[PDB]
Automatic annotation (TrEMBL), chains A, B:
Keywords: Metal-binding, Zinc
Pfam families, sorted: AP_endonuc_2
GO molecular-function terms, A-Z: metal ion binding
UniProt key word Zinc: yes
Organism: Rhizobium meliloti (strain 1021) (Ensifer meliloti)
Binding annotation for Zn(2+): E140, D175, H202, E246
Lineage: Bacteria, Pseudomonadati, Pseudomonadota, Alphaproteobacteria, Hyphomicrobiales
Domain of life from the UniProt record: Bacteria
Name of this protein: Xylose isomerase-like TIM barrel domain-containing protein
Amino acid sequence: QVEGLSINLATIREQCGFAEAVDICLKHGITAIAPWRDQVAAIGLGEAGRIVRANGLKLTGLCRGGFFPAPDASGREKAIDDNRRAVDEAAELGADCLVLVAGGLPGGSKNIDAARRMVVEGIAAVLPHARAAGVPLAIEPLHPMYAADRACVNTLGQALDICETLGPGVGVAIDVYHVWWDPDLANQIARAGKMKAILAHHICDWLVPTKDMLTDRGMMGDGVIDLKGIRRRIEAAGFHGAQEVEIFSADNWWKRPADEVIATCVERYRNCCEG
Amino acid sequence: QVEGLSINLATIREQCGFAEAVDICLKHGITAIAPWRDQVAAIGLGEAGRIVRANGLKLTGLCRGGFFPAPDASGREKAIDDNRRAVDEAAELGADCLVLVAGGLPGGSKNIDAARRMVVEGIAAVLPHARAAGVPLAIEPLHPMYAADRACVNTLGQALDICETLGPGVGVAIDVYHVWWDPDLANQIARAGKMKAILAHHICDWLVPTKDMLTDRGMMGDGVIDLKGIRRRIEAAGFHGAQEVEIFSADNWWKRPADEVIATCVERYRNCCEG
Ligand SMILES: [Zn+2]
Ligand SMILES: [Zn+2]
């Protein structure tokens, strides 16, 4: 087995559905995954579970919940309801956390403070149901470039502020793509450790040049992130969970055979990632 | 006159050289500019000065200095030397500040902490010459997406930390494109005010979607930034200097007649920008 490696299934999403991805992962000695809700829906929740169990599969996360801002309270309630259903799916599959991607500005608002208030309210509204189901909520801070239209939780400091306020049952998914640049990263990781808030660690690389804002994530080692440096900090902070490969690569990795992608992931994980 | 408006000449860089840009600005009632060092070099420093003086032109900034990291001390010294020459140009033209864009990772380094140390060292090395010439150094924090390859000063908090440490003669250029997303923006602006560190304010907009990482800045009002909200904070912090339009728009504004761009800038400034 490749111990301590997980594959977020977005990494081979062009190539595979849920059943085939799991098959390819188990064949390469990988026994931990993070599936997406649409992948689960395509195979069916009952079959997804059967597969999880038949291998006692570790799910490092379910992607994703969140998307809280909306112009009206009823739209915000509709989002809260979707998150409760997401929690239920995570529980059924035994996921280590439900990943939350906050949502950006609602409608045509320029009020980012208000959108952020909506996100905190939504997480607060979902948290009782998530605590009750045994599903930790992982706020994934997203890269600042995504603030307007994808997620207005944009720093680890901000995400940890929300955690500290709401209390137990909410933590952070630390994705290197989203946080590597942060000048206060070392402090916030140590802070997350002391709060016991680290729920997941996602890996990939920042390419130079980066050629697309969303779908040009690098394979570990092809970019400029000090991955080992970051992993060492995360472990020193007390998180020893699996490193989860999440690569969106429209023009490279999504065009290669899935077996080549997963094998490269094993190779890079051993050479570039371990702390 | 359009009081309180400045045009960073990058906004019409495809259309105009220095002499023609100034002509177009003065014709639309704009009497403040921020030229680039290559534009000054193309017209010649002596002629640039003659033009500045013939109108008593306000320069809200000179773009740019910085670019401090390099793999070797001699490369770092070469950068420091270039910055001293940049200071001299700013002095000669009577610029309100020399804008500093930090530089990204040197060579093939993954050590962003070290590159940041190099930037602080470089600013520290240039500062005596800049103090002596009467040229304030404006650290311009750049958007986090630029961290690897353009500038590893990426938050207003980080930039103000450097200012506070080095002391007098170094402040911040606050560009809305670079900082609008920052969850601690309100606090850091108030902080910059208390330190008396605000040297410039650059305006433009964040488009949704943004279609290019470098050259798809919006015209004020076409995007999602609360420009008036930010300007009000800057004024409450005690900076009442000109708002400087800096737009890099490869597929829109750089393809329009310069007169139409500058007229739109006046229109939006009056409608969308004033606090
Ligand atoms: Zn992630
Ligand atoms: Zn700027």
